[PDB]
Amino acid sequence: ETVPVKLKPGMDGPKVKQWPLTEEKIKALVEICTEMEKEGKISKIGPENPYNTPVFAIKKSTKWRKLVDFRELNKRTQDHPAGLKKKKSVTVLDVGDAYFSVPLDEDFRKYTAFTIPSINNETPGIRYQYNVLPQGWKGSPAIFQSSMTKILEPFRKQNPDIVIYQYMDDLYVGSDLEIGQHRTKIEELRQHLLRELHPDKWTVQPIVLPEKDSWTVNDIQKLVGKLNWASQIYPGIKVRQLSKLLRGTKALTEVIPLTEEAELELAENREILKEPVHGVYYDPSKDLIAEIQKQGQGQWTYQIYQEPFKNLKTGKYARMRGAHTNDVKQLTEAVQKITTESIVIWGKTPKFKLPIQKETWETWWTEYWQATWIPEWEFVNTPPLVKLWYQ
Amino acid sequence: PISPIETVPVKLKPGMDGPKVKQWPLTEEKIKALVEICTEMEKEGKISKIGPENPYNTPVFAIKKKDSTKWRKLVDFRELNKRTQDFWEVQLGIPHPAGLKKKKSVTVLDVGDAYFSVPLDEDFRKYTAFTIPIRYQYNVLPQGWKGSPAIFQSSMTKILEPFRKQNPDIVIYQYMDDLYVGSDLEIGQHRTKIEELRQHLLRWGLTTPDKKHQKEPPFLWMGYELHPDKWTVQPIVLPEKDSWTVNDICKLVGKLNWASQIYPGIKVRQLSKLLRGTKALTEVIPLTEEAELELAENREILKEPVHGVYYDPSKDLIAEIQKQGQGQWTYQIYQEPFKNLKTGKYARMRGAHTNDVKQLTEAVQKITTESIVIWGKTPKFKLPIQKETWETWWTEYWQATWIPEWEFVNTPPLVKLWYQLEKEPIVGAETFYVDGAANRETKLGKAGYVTNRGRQKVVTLTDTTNQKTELQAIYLALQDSGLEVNIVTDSQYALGIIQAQPDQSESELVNQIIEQLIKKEKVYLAWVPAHKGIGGNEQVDKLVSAGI
DNA sequence: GTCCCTGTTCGGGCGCCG
DNA sequence: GGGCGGCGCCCGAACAGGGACT
Ligand SMILES: *P(=O)(O)OC[C@@H]1O[C@H](n2cc(F)c(N)nc2=O)CS1
Ligand SMILES: [Mg+2]
Ligand SMILES: [Mg+2]
Numbered sequence: 001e002t003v004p005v006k007l008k009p010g011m012d013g014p015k016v017k018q019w020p021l022t023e024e025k026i027k028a029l030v031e032i033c034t035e036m037e038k039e040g041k042i043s044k045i046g047p048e049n050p051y052n053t054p055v056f057a058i059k060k061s062t063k064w065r066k067l068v069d070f071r072e073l074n075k076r077t078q079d080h081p082a083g084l085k086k087k088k089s090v091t092v093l094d095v096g097d098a099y100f101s102v103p104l105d106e107d108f109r110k111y112t113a114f115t116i117p118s119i120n121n122e123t124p125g126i127r128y129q130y131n132v133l134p135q136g137w138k139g140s141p142a143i144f145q146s147s148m149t150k151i152l153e154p155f156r157k158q159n160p161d162i163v164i165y166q167y168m169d170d171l172y173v174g175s176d177l178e179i180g181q182h183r184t185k186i187e188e189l190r191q192h193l194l195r196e197l198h199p200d201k202w203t204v205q206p207i208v209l210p211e212k213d214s215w216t217v218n219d220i221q222k223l224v225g226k227l228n229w230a231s232q233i234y235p236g237i238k239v240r241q242l243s244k245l246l247r248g249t250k251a252l253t254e255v256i257p258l259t260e261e262a263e264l265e266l267a268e269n270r271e272i273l274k275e276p277v278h279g280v281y282y283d284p285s286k287d288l289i290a291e292i293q294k295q296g297q298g299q300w301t302y303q304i305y306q307e308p309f310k311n312l313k314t315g316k317y318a319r320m321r322g323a324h325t326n327d328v329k330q331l332t333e334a335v336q337k338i339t340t341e342s343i344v345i346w347g348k349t350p351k352f353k354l355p356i357q358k359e360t361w362e363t364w365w366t367e368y369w370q371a372t373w374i375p376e377w378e379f380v381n382t383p384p385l386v387k388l389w390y391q
Numbered sequence: 392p393i394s395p396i397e398t399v400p401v402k403l404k405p406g407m408d409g410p411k412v413k414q415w416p417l418t419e420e421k422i423k424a425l426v427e428i429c430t431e432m433e434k435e436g437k438i439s440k441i442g443p444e445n446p447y448n449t450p451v452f453a454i455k456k457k458d459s460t461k462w463r464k465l466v467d468f469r470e471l472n473k474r475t476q477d478f479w480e481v482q483l484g485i486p487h488p489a490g491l492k493k494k495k496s497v498t499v500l501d502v503g504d505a506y507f508s509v510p511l512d513e514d515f516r517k518y519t520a521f522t523i524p525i526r527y528q529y530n531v532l533p534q535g536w537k538g539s540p541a542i543f544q545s546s547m548t549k550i551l552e553p554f555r556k557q558n559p560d561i562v563i564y565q566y567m568d569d570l571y572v573g574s575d576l577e578i579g580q581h582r583t584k585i586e587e588l589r590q591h592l593l594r595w596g597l598t599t600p601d602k603k604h605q606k607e608p609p610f611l612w613m614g615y616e617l618h619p620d621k622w623t624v625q626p627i628v629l630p631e632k633d634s635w636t637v638n639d640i641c642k643l644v645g646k647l648n649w650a651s652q653i654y655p656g657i658k659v660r661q662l663s664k665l666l667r668g669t670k671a672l673t674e675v676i677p678l679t680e681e682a683e684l685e686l687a688e689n690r691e692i693l694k695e696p697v698h699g700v701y702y703d704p705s706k707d708l709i710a711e712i713q714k715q716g717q718g719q720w721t722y723q724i725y726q727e728p729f730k731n732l733k734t735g736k737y738a739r740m741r742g743a744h745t746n747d748v749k750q751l752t753e754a755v756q757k758i759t760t761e762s763i764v765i766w767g768k769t770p771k772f773k774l775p776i777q778k779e780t781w782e783t784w785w786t787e788y789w790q791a792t793w794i795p796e797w798e799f800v801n802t803p804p805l806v807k808l809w810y811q812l813e814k815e816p817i818v819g820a821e822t823f824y825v826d827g828a829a830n831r832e833t834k835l836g837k838a839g840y841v842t843n844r845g846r847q848k849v850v851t852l853t854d855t856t857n858q859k860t861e862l863q864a865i866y867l868a869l870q871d872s873g874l875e876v877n878i879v880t881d882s883q884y885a886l887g888i889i890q891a892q893p894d895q896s897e898s899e900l901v902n903q904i905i906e907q908l909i910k911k912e913k914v915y916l917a918w919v920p921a922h923k924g925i926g927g928n929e930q931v932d933k934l935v936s937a938g939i
Numbered sequence: 940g941t942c943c944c945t946g947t948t949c950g951g952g953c954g955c956c957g
Numbered sequence: 958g959g960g961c962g963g964c965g966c967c968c969g970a971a972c973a974g975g976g977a978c979t
Contacts, residue, residue: 127481243925482957543962649955649966
């Protein structure tokens with residue numbers, strides 16, 4: 001028995017062209033789709049359905065998992081434990097398979113259309129639509145919510161300390177237990193469901209000022225610029241005295257000794273950079289912006305904010321590697337880590353401002369995706385100034 | 392006959408009606424061809440005579456085909472097309488012969504009168520009405536209706552599905568109604584399977600006329616001649632005109648881009664630049680010297696004989712890239728060293744300012760996705776860029792960039808960064824504090840500098856902008872400094888441009904700047920916030936502000 | 940806000956296939 | 958002569974976004 005769903009008023013369904021898949025992905029998709037259609041989960045369709053949503057596959061194991069980029073459909077589809085961010089360990093189970101049991105509103109099926117492509121365009125694309133709740137669709141956890149609650153009732157009663165949160169395809173299970181009997185409890189929950197993260201170790205990456213025993217006109221000029229920008233975030237920051245050292249037209253390399261006033265100003269600003277940002281409240285009605293900066297040498301900084309300079313969180317991803325490093329792979333790993341953190345903290349995924357060319361990103365990011373969700377993103381060709389401020 | 396495939400339901404767009412357009416006059420030859428076609432189609436039930444019960448009508452004509460006496464019957468369904476619902480096109484791309492694997496036995500077939508063998512949704516037939524100077528309606532797919540390509544391609548896929556499921560190891564390239572059929576069978580068993588396929592297709596209402604049943608090589612297919620172990624493109628004929636119009640140039644460049652898929656070294660930058668800000672196709676553009684030279688070189692290239700090979704999946708895919716000038720690149724994709732699978736050109740200009748490493752990166756990207764389409768895998772690269780060049784660039788560039796498995800190749804022009812900003816300021820070198828200001832109302836500006844050695848200069852400018860004046864200040868410092876110089880700007884605009892290390896700009900001023908930067912031994916560019924009283928910057932700001 | 944500049948999309952023309 | 962769909966290419970005309978200015 002199905003549940004009717006509409007789109008948002010004034011909106012049509014997704015019309016997103018499929019991107020080129022590799023042979024291994026098309027093969028995995030064809031085999032998976034054959035099985036899915038044998039089981040009545042999907043049906044073949046043709047050109048008279050005007051909608052489309054790209055599909056691909058990820059190898060998490062020698063089994064592939066189909067992944068549908070429902071970002072658009074999700075935007076267009078009709079419309080949280082604050083203690084989960086504190087569990088000693090949190091495990092992430094894929095429970096999307098559940099959704100293949102609930103039927104899908106017939107009038108809605110046309111919006112879940114997708115196309116399997118062909119190597120070298122041997123054939124036209126071969127199109128399908130869904131007859132059950134699709135994985136990767138906002139509506140699937142929503143409609144399955146009641147059955148999920150009934151399924152998880154006795155496990156939560158028998159484990160009142162454990163926090164079980166759901167985000168779209170995944171169960172985030174959080175405990176303060178030692179990671180060994182924790183794994184025991186997770187296998188209890190997986191056996192029960194026939195019917196590894198550590199948020200207490202996440203930390204803020206603060207702004208840091210250079211420690212020097214000799215300062216040049218260049219050093220002080222760079223400091224004043226950094227502090228000027230930082231003051232937009234910490235209004236307590238003061239530059240008047242350091243800037244006073246710069247009067248005149250001096251050679252960049254000239255050594256300038258700090259006065260007493262400027263040394264105290266720098267110590268005060270040093271302390272002010274430790275205090276937490278004042279006046280930053282999470283707005284559920286707004287998106288989460290996540291900016292990433294590539295700092296070089298496998299170092300990445302990021303900020304999660306909703307209004308400019310109101311950072312909900314700042315952090316870094318530091319995969320220390322030089323010999324053979326893949327900026328794109330690292331960047332998609334960073335994106336997945338940041339998204340995981342945001343899902344855990346706020347239950348939303350961020351919109352990413354990615355420091356990459358759109359084409360490079362779109363060429364390679366599917367080679368490294370490992371998550372069942374996909375965040376919004378845009379591509380910035382953004383400046384080296386903010387890059388310098390977060391290093 | 393008519394295919395017993397179930398029809399595909401098609402609606403008009405929300406709240407619309409069928410076409411009500413009056414016919415136009417037709418020639419005697421066109422009317423005779425139309426009437427012969429129409430009585431023959433009426434016998435077969437592909438068109439049904441209609442009377443007063445049909446309000447709608449839309450125009451009809453015919454054109455000569457590539458076969459001699461056969462006329463193609465066409466309808467101007469532009470109005471119906473407007474009113475007809477949207478489809479998802481299922482033809483995602485064009486098959487390419489470099490993507491074919493060697494087969495023991497090959498056949499090429501065409502389906503005759505293909506659209507006219509697939510039934511049209513009964514409800515929709517009435518909107519397809521037309522007269523002949525006799526009133527008919529379409530019972531099959533018409534030519535010129537926007538739904539016909541996709542409906543036919545999908546219906547053909549459905550029609551072939553049982554033969555493909557029964558013969559998974561026979562490869563059938565299915566472009567619209569054209570089939571290429573490859574098998575690892577000895578020629579006799581293959582021919583039997585082909586008779587099986589033709590009987591299968593005919594069972595589904597598709598006839599394969601023997602006149603278009605190619606049994607021996609070479610096969611004519613998709614613009615190519617397929618030989619047993621090599622393929623070629625059917626000949627290309629560039630016009631040999633003297634007065635070139637925008638249409639003439641569009642044709643020339645389209646044929647050249649088509650040729651570039653197997654002819655190495657094709658360049659169309661100069662012929663393409665020749666089209667900027669055009670009025671109409673009929674305008675006569677005069678060939679600039681550089682376009683004349685480039686067209687000559689292209690002609691020479693095309694005089695050579697060339698071929699591609701077929702894909703061997705048990706080997707590596709290799710792509711080698713060479714740089715030509717002006718942001719142009721060609722590439723050869725091969726598996727064995729002198730046997731190109733195919734070739735190509737990348738020449739797209741991304742960005743006001745760029746350099747050869749960015750351009751190379753985006754050529755690598757374009758080639759990578761093109762390879763994923765044709766062969767389903769990424770190729771291994773051979774690039775004229777030293778691993779150290781790349782390492783430097785990836786180190787110091789603020790954006791995530793990456794090139795897949797590659798190997799340096801020593802064929803010039805090697806790709807290099809043409810200058811290198813200092814990471815630290817230069818001791819002893821003169822320090823220029825630069826600024827510009829522009830008056831938004833008058834568009835007068837000043838650019839200039841002070842220096843720690845006491846020099847100061849202001850250049851006035853007319854018809855300028857703030858960004859232009861910031862650049863002119865940097866350019867003025869480069870002009871008046873020596874081989875080593877520190878420069879302090881308050882302009883993150885100019886800083887971002889110059890840190891990016893461009894070797895080419897569409898801005899003449901940025902190019903002059905670039906030339907200066909290439910001439911210098913050491914250059915350090917530093918940034919400071921404007922209007923905060925910072926020492927050197929304050930005096931320049933006071934100098935260039937005087938006019939504003 | 941406005942002006943300037945930069946990047947992206949999308950629709951026009953041609954080529955090629957059918 | 959002209960109708961259609963696909964893909965390629967290039968260009969210009971809309972936008973969007975961000976920095977600088979009054
Ligand atoms: P195919 O049917 O094998 O014909 C060869 C080329 O096709 C061109 N053609 C085909 C077609 F289906 C439509 N609608 N237009 C068109 O020009 C003519 S020669
Ligand atoms: Mg203060
Ligand atoms: Mg300025």
